[PDB]
Design a protein around this ligand. Structure first.
Ligand SMILES: Cc1ccc(C(=O)NCCCCC[n+]2ccccc2/C=N/O)cc1[N+](=O)[O-]
Ligand SMILES: Cc1ccc(C(=O)NCCCCC[n+]2ccccc2/C=N/O)cc1[N+](=O)[O-]
Ligand SMILES: *[C@@H]1O[C@H](CO)[C@@H](O)[C@H](O)[C@H]1NC(C)=O
Ligand SMILES: *[C@@H]1O[C@H](CO)[C@@H](O)[C@H](O)[C@H]1NC(C)=O
Ligand SMILES: *[C@@H]1O[C@H](CO)[C@@H](O)[C@H](O)[C@H]1NC(C)=O
Ligand SMILES: *[C@@H]1O[C@H](CO)[C@@H](O)[C@H](O)[C@H]1NC(C)=O
Lengths: 533, 537
């Protein structure tokens, strides 16, 4: 049997499987356990490293998906399903995946580690969209992706308790990073060049690893696609975590901290997920029930405090957003919107919609939002109100958090590269009015167009290769620029002075300045003053 | 009479007048300068509403300009055409309620449309005799009858102890109403059509025109209105009865005069200069574009606040021309905002921009002041001295003119008014202020009145043709309620500003260009958001 598929890690022996990528084979090792199954009395608790095993462990299928809510808004429709889990659901989910060139790389090759999104409430590394074969085959890189516990299982927290101290979903991630140090070299990977890269709740996670001192020993570069540790959706405070947890328990019959969590532990998983979405304080979209918590442990203070004072003199970061961040979430809450019609909306609906999109907003601040996004040359135009409602949601939750993060990281000594992803997929299945929705750069970063049977267009293939090389160049060097290309489109560092980012689309690189600068001043500088008065 | 010119002798309701034959570039005009229309408001009549001028015997000589209402005289740059041209050019006296009349020579045989000019000057200065208010060119070239009156300014026009008989305030406006009454009764004697009367006025004068639109007694004395770079609404044009009462009793304390009757009576015994020497001293906060004594919302001349009246009144039977210059703000900065001067480029620091905002927007709380700075800042270049300077000019200009105007045009329009709106974009080649100030507040006036037609004034040939075009616009609007030429559809047309399309025209040396959105986004800030922010603080 094939020696390229046979690898010895500190915990046993692994048989991977050889996979065909469009222009070569790759070695894949799928379903490697990195922690003891967090079932039973281990539910809600920090993971423990995997006991050693006997024999040769099979690593050729994807393991089960962490237990999570499964979307039903559009049953059968491909643009929603593609995010739904494709393996069975289980609490027994702490496994990771590794792809690598075939043959195994001679010299040590940079590692890329991918943390999926899904609002800390869903997701899985086994999605077709996260296929690591292309990056491995084409760019010669070693790619690791992990599962982490999501929902109540990953982030339910009674802070200061021992039985549920919070953030265990992040600790799942952290163990996989320790595993990559202890084991990746056996695959050819370089433990001394590890890039984290993730999207949405993934990017938020990546950020939280930048902001937690024990994680900094485990990676060297980070990529934050369309998400941030800061902003309104990614963290709660200790007080609010305790409130949502004690309410979920009441909503499932339970019942002291120990008595309280112990009863939850005796509850079939679906009984907890049935009531997940039911503890949110106000009516919401782009607000999630269970998410990281400011515990003084993993997060010593709020990410806002931490980015505002940290020293990032060593860091290298690549941040960015898509053209239409907020459009995806509008169909999941905001009346008037729907994937099936044009979602032309009235001024009444737009006023109502802002209270949803900005649930924490007072009366005064929600009129401040309506007066800002309104085109007063066409104040009743159904098309502008629609596009603006989406802009509110995208800017409040993603684009302006990214702008604040990029600002502070760069100011505090980091090398930042900022982008905006402006190409919509020809394959895409949502209506035209959503433009480029939240999450549809990923298929291009993972090189999916290179598979000929996905019916992507030829320039999309050429586009995919440009991005695949921007990222892997970042991973190699901390600079997305080819060190052998002398074609003028160069990607400049983002700075506080010049605030320059580039646009990712089919045309060559174009350098722009200010990342919705006037509009982010409104969100980042003024509205904080407004609510606190 | 004998050997007198028989086209310069005219009888009015108060007696006979001898006028004068002026040379204009293209022929002569008749001018009647210094016609009294009220009893001089001296002595016990100070602060009182005007009384109609008792008739005189003999033939009154009306060939020179009369006195200027008692007023503060600017002394910022002494001997510099920029400031002097607005400074009073006759003797200062409380005896000052006189008006002037220009008419074609010979006086027209048909009944000619009338234009009545009301000068700006912040309700604290001004005179109908300034060289830029010269009716000789409008009268000669467009064939029109121009009337401009003196109205009392400062304490003497607007100091008010509301509710009292001795000082009911707003008498400065009641002067203007008397002159409008006068034009009704006597303008036929000069060939004028008392059924085609158009008020038109700049700044404080434009404000005044607005008060006449909003006051029912004035509404039968005119038919159309042009408001240039000023409004009755807005922050500076009016004060509440409470504020006027406070400013008056402090001015009394300041000159020695601590029941309202006894207080006013003491003030009546005070040299006119004593009052002028102290009016700048009762403003609540360190400000610019804030004026001590202005119209008061007395419930009489103005039944409610201007803001209330334009929201709710009917205006179908109304035609209005409104507009603004490009740089409304720049002139006021050098009179207050530290960092600004006519002699250097006025490149300020971000520190000075925050200091400035607190002055330009003196009613703003800390939070509102922050919102303004947040909005006017260029966040790609938040410390750029050139951008900061221009932004500071734009804050004063939008707060005080362009957004009251935009609110006025929008509010009138929605309620039946036919509205035309312009932005005046040409800087006079003869301008003496520095280049950074752009087209300052007040420097379209010389072009409406036609001064570039005077060869001695050293304008350009294009400025001459330009000034002719504007005179046609204004007077066509007086004649018809429409600045467009009937016998000319080739040249671009000037559409009415409606709420639905917010259309307005540029006025520059190039042909009319139609634009949409009178600072649409930024006036949402001032006319919509900031009132709510003041409200909830
Ligand atoms: C349970 C659920 C379901 C959809 C969302 C959501 O906002 N999706 C977009 C969010 C939740 N959640 O609260 O976890
Ligand atoms: C008494 C006075 C004097 C100058 C001003 C004033 O604002 N001048 C600058 C504007 C040109 C204003 C006053 N005032 O408030 O009456
Ligand atoms: C689009 O469809 C949804 C559900 O079918 C509906 O609620 C919404 O009103 C529709 N929108 C328009 C603009 O017709
Ligand atoms: C691509 O299109 C062809 C026909 O044009 C079809 O046979 C094939 O199944 C399609 N593949 C996908 C992934 O849509
Ligand atoms: C311009 O001159 C005035 C007084 O002469 C001064 O106060 C101001 O600071 C100067 N501005 C600059 C930019 O030099
Ligand atoms: C106009 O120009 C002439 C020619 O130089 C000059 O003598 C005169 O003083 C100037 N007058 C004005 C008002 O500029």
């Amino acid at each position: 049997e094939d020696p390229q598929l046979l690898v010895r890690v500190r915990g046993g022996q692994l048989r991977g499987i050889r996979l065909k990528a469009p222009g070569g084979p790759v070695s894949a090792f799928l379903g490697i356990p990195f922690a003891e199954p967090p079932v039973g009395s281990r539910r809600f608790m920090p993971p423990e490293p995997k006991r050693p095993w006997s024999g040769v462990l099979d690593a050729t299928t994807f393991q089960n998906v962490c237990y999570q809510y499964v979307d039903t808004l559009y049953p059968g429709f491909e643009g929603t399903e593609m995010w739904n889990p494709n393996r069975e659901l289980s609490e027994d989910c702490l496994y990771l995946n590794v792809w690598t060139p075939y043959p195994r790389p001679a010299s040590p090759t940079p590692v890329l580690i991918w943390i999926y999104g899904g609002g800390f409430y869903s997701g899985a590394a086994s999605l077709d969209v996260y296929d690591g074969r292309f990056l491995a085959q084409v760019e010669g890189a070693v790619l690791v992706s992990m599962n982490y516990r999501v929902g109540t299982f990953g982030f339910l927290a009674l802070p200061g308790s021992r039985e549920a101290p919070g953030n265990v979903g992040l600790l799942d991630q952290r163990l996989a990073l320790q595993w990559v140090q202890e084991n990746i070299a056996a695959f050819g990977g370089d433990p001394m060049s590890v890039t984290l890269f993730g999207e949405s709740a993934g990017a938020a996670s990546v950020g939280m690893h930048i902001l937690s001192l024990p994680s900094r020993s485990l990676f060297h570069r980070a990529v934050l696609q369309s998400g941030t540790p800061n902003g309104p959706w990614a963290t709660v405070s200790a007080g609010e975590a305790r409130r949502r947890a004690t309410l979920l328990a009441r909503l499932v019959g339970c019942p002291n901290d120990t008595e309280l969590i112990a009863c939850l532990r005796t509850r079939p998983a679906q009984d907890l997920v049935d009531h997940e979405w039911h503890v949110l304080p106000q009516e919401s979209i782009f607000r999630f029930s269970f998410v990281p918590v400011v515990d003084g442990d993993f997060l010593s203070d709020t990410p806002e405090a931490l980015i505002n004072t940290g020293d990032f003199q060593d860091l290298q970061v690549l941040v960015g957003v898509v053209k239409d961040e907020g459009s995806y979430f509008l169909v999941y809450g905001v009346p008037g919107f729907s994937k099936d019609n044009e979602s032309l909306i009235s001024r009444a609906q737009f006023l109502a919609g802002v209270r949803i999109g900005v649930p924490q907003a007072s009366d005064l601040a929600a009129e401040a939002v309506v007066l800002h996004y309104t085109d007063w040359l066409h104040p009743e135009d159904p098309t502008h109100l629609r596009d603006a409602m989406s802009a509110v949601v995208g800017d409040h939750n993603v684009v302006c958090p990214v702008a604040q993060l990029a600002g502070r990281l760069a100011a505090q000594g980091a090398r930042v590269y900022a982008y905006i992803f402006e190409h919509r997929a020809s394959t895409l299945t949502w209506p035209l009015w959503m433009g480029v929705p939240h999450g549809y750069e990923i298929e291009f970063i993972f090189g999916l167009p290179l598979d000929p049977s996905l019916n992507y267009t030829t320039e999309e293939r050429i586009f995919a290769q440009r991005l695949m090389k921007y990222w892997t160049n970042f991973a190699r060097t901390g600079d997305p620029n080819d060190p052998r290309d002398s074609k003028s489109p160069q990607w400049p560092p983002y700075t506080t002075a010049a605030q320059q980012y580039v646009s990712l689309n089919l045309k060559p690189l174009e350098v722009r300045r200010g990342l919705r600068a006037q509009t982010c001043a409104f969100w980042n500088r003024f509205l904080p003053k407004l609510l606190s008065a």
